[PDB]
């Protein structure tokens, strides 16, 4: 899995602990070995939400399985909570997209997964 | 909706007015309340197009509905126009992808939309 | 086509030659005119893989056709090789997603491709 998140919050506010916590959370909620988990957080971005430059963010959780029409709402609760707790972004100013990737459509160690 | 765009044009050339104009445009063309619209512009990127580092960009407009096989060409006219007008990027050196996201596959305020 | 790749490796390690080589490689492997190829490399990112901040990266190759359940494994061999050769990232610390985009869902020169 890959969790990516882009935000206009300052880099200083983005800590090693945040990425390590997200990493562990994503492994748990998707039931994936953490050796497969990538986390990518991009601060200091030029963004607006609702037409204003107040703190906001947009991100994606991509995985082969684990994401799914009936699991994603739970995933969203957990991920919005950790981001709000560390970064302070309001829930009405952030999105997370969930992408279920076919195994033939993502590669790792020089090969696709199918 | 989310409009994201990555470019090698200088940050100084990227203005608050550009993001606010895009925000209003996206709300209009997708018939979405602007309270749901996110805009994300990333300058000073390391890019090539056609094998050269002249100004270029790539972006995505993602939405639950509003994008669609018969509406996207119109969207593209409008978005290419505003980006060329502000940033000066030639149309043959930029892409915009349109992504129709299922409601179960994106979250806002701690919940998916389905 | 668009090849995008995000990494925590230093910008200095990312050279004009790397982007030009990728550009030529992507044109060859997808059988696309290089005039349509965009390359986007983003260094100095805040990332983890397997819970650690050692060098890693995540990227996407998007195209109208050329990518496909039976061609992607070959694409992955080639792209992992060039990235490892230039940037030194281990194969077990990087992903590349392949996205087959419908022609109606991407625009160039102010129009969608369908």
Descriptive key words:
homotrimer, 114 residues, alpha/beta, Macrophage Migration Inhibitory Factor, four-stranded mixed beta sheet, 7 strands, 30% strand
Could you characterize the architecture of this molecule?
The structure is a homotrimer of 114-residue chains. With 114 residues, chain A is of the alpha/beta class. Chain A has a single domain (2-105), classed as Macrophage Migration Inhibitory Factor (2-Layer Sandwich), CATH 3.30.429.10. Chain A is built from two helices and seven strands. Chain A has helices at residues 16-30, 72-87; strands at 2-7, 38-42, 46-49, 57-63, 94-100, 106-108, 111-112. Chain A has a four-stranded mixed sheet, covered by helices on one side. In chain A, a hairpin with a 2-residue loop joins strand 6 and strand 7. The interface between A and C is medium-sized, with 32 and 31 residues. The PDB classes it as cytokine. Keywords: MIF, parasite, helminth, orthologue, cytokine. The assembly is trimeric. The entry is titled "Macrophage Migration Inhibitory Factor 2 from Heligmosomoides polygyrus".
């Amino acid at each position: 899995p890959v969790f990516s998140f882009h935000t206009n919050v300052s880099e200083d506010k983005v800590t090693p602990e945040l990425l390590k916590q997200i990493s562990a959370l994503v492994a748990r909620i998707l039931h994936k070995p953490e050796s497969y988990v990538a986390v990518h957080i991009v601060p200091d971005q030029k963004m607006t939400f609702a037409g204003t430059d107040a703190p906001c963010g947009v991100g994606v959780l991509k995985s082969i399985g684990g994401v799914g029409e009936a699991q994603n709402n739970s995933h969203a609760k957990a991920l919005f909570a950790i981001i709000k707790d560390h970064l302070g972004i309001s829930g009405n100013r952030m999105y997370i997209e969930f992408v279920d990737i076919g195994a033939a459509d993502i590669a790792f160690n020089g090969k696709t997964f199918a």
